[PDB]
């Protein structure tokens, strides 16, 4: 329930407990992960662990605005992770701007805006990112990119627009921070676009509720969890870290 | 989190509180509803409010097995609700057997079974019910049937298969009971099919985690919530009910 959810601080706690208990799950790539299964929490902070990176977030936003399905179109030197999951032609699936703004994905943003504009109380205000053909599209031309965001639903209650984000899979360190920045962007845009449609509406952004099948940390970031466990600091440079996960 | 979720009994409590507070939300059809927004709970009981109806549940299962998109194919006299939301030709979208078993929805069940059969720890085991074109398909030929189940993800941890059900919209009285029966059916089938594939697996059914954008009761069922609020009885016949919601 929206008003009675876990917080990000409680998510940190449960991830710390999973590491302490050595409750490891082996990733498809062979490395260890720790997870929360069926996570559900209000994103009351914009990160869980790790450093800020407004600069990558702005690059990702421009890539999303371009709607390009090719990773080289990310501004600047495209990150190694995107080069690795891309197809033989540099193609991917998970351009979230394509997902919500392309006519080839059935105009998710515009139809959600139109639905809520005609019925503010509607339960049908949703942006549908994934697709049934993803069962075969996730490795087209050799890519490795099964859509992780499934749907985001928008529910206007007491003049606040709440976003229910439904994710299959979310990396705690980079994925959550980037995805949170993106979902908050879309929510603020929907609030603004609805308010611009009619000055009587006077909507505000509500809560972003994060629901994840597997919310996980890769072994290469266990040091961030361990350092926080010991100190309460949500970030440390890998250079400065002292512990058993170097 | 799977191990630290709300229960059905807590869902009843919060629905009772919403009714007592008269926190009403007007349905698209004009009637009042009460809701939990962003509900997330373990389905530790197979119903919330209302009487059992194994007989309708078995009829719905046969309809799902047929994969028919036409409501007359529901065994017996098709319920009035299905006649009302169907198209001019008797057609709908929400045949969940079509969703997971039709090749026209990209073989969701079979691909999820194959994914988990090759990698038990996979995060990509999912059955995708809704589709991006639902933004236009929900009222094809005059129907009124926007898919309410978005995705169901299956995560095998400690040899238990957990189902994370992601729903846009769920009627507490009929919808949840019917949908729970269906999701438990699919989960038990996936457990059985995986175990039949390899006797070393020895999987068991885990928890079914229910995540709903709007989990709601229509005004025509407020009497069930009110009676439970006053007595703790999860059912009463409309005839026998005494109260302000007759
Ligand atoms: N299979 C796999 N696929 C993935 C991810 C993963 O984990 N594994 N991660 C998902 C989330 N996307 C990102 C995007 C950027 C980065 C990243 O690494 N960012 C650097 C910048 C990198 C750079 O600019 O060179 C930073 O410090 O912000 C990580 C995950 C995308 N797909
Ligand atoms: N817009 C709208 N669309 C809906 C529902 C709704 O609420 N409103 N409800 C959703 C869930 N499906 C059902 C299926 C059956 C019944 C129902 O009514 N069952 C009777 C049997 C009816 C009969 O056999 O005649 C019983 O007592 O079990 C209600 C919702 C389907 N779509
Ligand atoms: N928006 C996204 C997309 C992907 N990922 C991460 C989650 C997983 O770490 C990986 C996808 O791997 P899989 O498809 O095996 O879940 O990418 C993420 O955190 N956020
Ligand atoms: N599997 C389903 C499908 C539908 N519904 C109910 C939820 C809503 O009461 C209605 C759909 O209306 P809307 O599309 O306006 O949410 O049907 C449900 O409870 N379970």
Numbering used by the authors:
A (entry chain A), B (entry chain A): 1 to 246
Paper excerpt:
To protect viral DNA against the host bacterial restriction system, bacterio­phages utilize a special modification system – hydroxymethylation – in which dCMP hydroxymethylase (dCH) converts dCMP to 5-hydroxymethyl-dCMP (5hm-dCMP) using N5,N10-methylenetetrahydrofolate as a cofactor. Despite shared similarity with thymidylate synthase (TS), dCH catalyzes hydroxylation through an exocyclic methylene intermediate during the last step, which is different from the hydride transfer that occurs with TS. The dCH from T4 bacteriophage (T4dCH) was the first identified viral enzyme, which catalyzes the conversion of dCMP to 5hm-dCMP using mTHF and water as methyl and hydroxyl donors, respectively. Despite its low sequence identity, dCH belongs to the thymidylate synthase (TS) superfamily due to its similar tertiary structure.
Here, we report the crystal structure of the ternary complex of T4dCH (C148S/D179N mutant) bound to dCMP and THF at 1.9 Å resolution. A reasonable electron density for THF could not be obtained from crystals of T4dCH WT; therefore, the active-site double mutant C148S/D179N was used for crystallization. The THF molecule resides in a narrow and deep binding pocket formed by α-helices B, C and G. The enzymatically active cavity for hydroxymethylation is formed along to the narrow binding site of THF, which links to the dCMP binding site. The THF completely occludes the dCMP molecule from the bulk solvent [Fig. 1(c)]. The Cα root-mean-square deviation (RMSD) between the ternary and binary complex structures is only 0.26 Å, and that between the ternary complex and the apo structure is 0.39 Å. These results suggest that no global conformational changes are triggered by THF binding [Fig. 1(d)]. The closed conformation of the apo or binary complex blocks the PABA ring-binding region. THF binding induces local structural changes in Ile81 and Phe174 [Figs. S5(d) and S5(e)]. The branched side chain of Ile81 and the aromatic ring of Phe174 rotate to the outside of the active site, which opens the PABA ring binding site and simultaneously closes the dCMP binding pocket. In summary, despite the lack of a C-terminal tail, T4dCH also recognizes the same cofactor, THF, using different residues in the THF binding pocket. The main-chain nitrogen and side-chain hydroxyl oxygen of Ser94 form a polar interaction with the side-chain carboxylate of Asp145. Furthermore, a potential key water molecule (Wat1) is located within hydrogen-bonding distance of the carboxylate of Asp145 as well as the N1 atom of the pterin ring [Fig. 3(c)].
